[PDB]
């Protein structure tokens with residue numbers, strides 16, 4: 389019950405709930421809480437939350453959650469990120 | 470949402486909810502209702518209820534639910550059935 393799988397635009401991003409729980413107040417912080425099945429899109433057959441967003445930049449967002457420093461991917465426009 | 474899978478001792482018995490809903494008051498009748506996830510053993514990963522019983526005779530119990538006539542399997546003792 390420590391692992392959580394985010395399905396962002398069809399790409400499965402997997403992480404521990406502690407990682408999401410680091411940065412409070414943000415959307416993924418609300419994901420990490422146990423009252424998240426009702427709040428967010430979720431299918432119990434695969435145990436994944438689905439967000440209809442660009443996955444390539446969510447990699448860097450989740451990297452912010454993991455390491456603690458926010459960086460900009462040099463392969464997307466400024467406004468996109 | 471019309472199909473329901475019963476896992477009886479490791480053998481998957483599949484049926485429609487109407488079939489279970491035919492005979493009221495019995496255990497499978499309570500299974501057919503929408504408030505059955507909490508009442509009974511159930512895992513959302515496979516969407517199956519698990520009962521730790523002999524499956525070979527549950528075949529005949531479910532056949533009672535389907536056809537409407539209760540028969541005894543001639544391959545098990547009287548007290549077992």
Ligand SMILES: [Zn+2]
Nearest residue numbers: 465466467468
């Ligand atoms: Zn641009």
Ligand SMILES: [Zn+2]
Nearest residue numbers: 546547548549
């Ligand atoms: Zn016997």
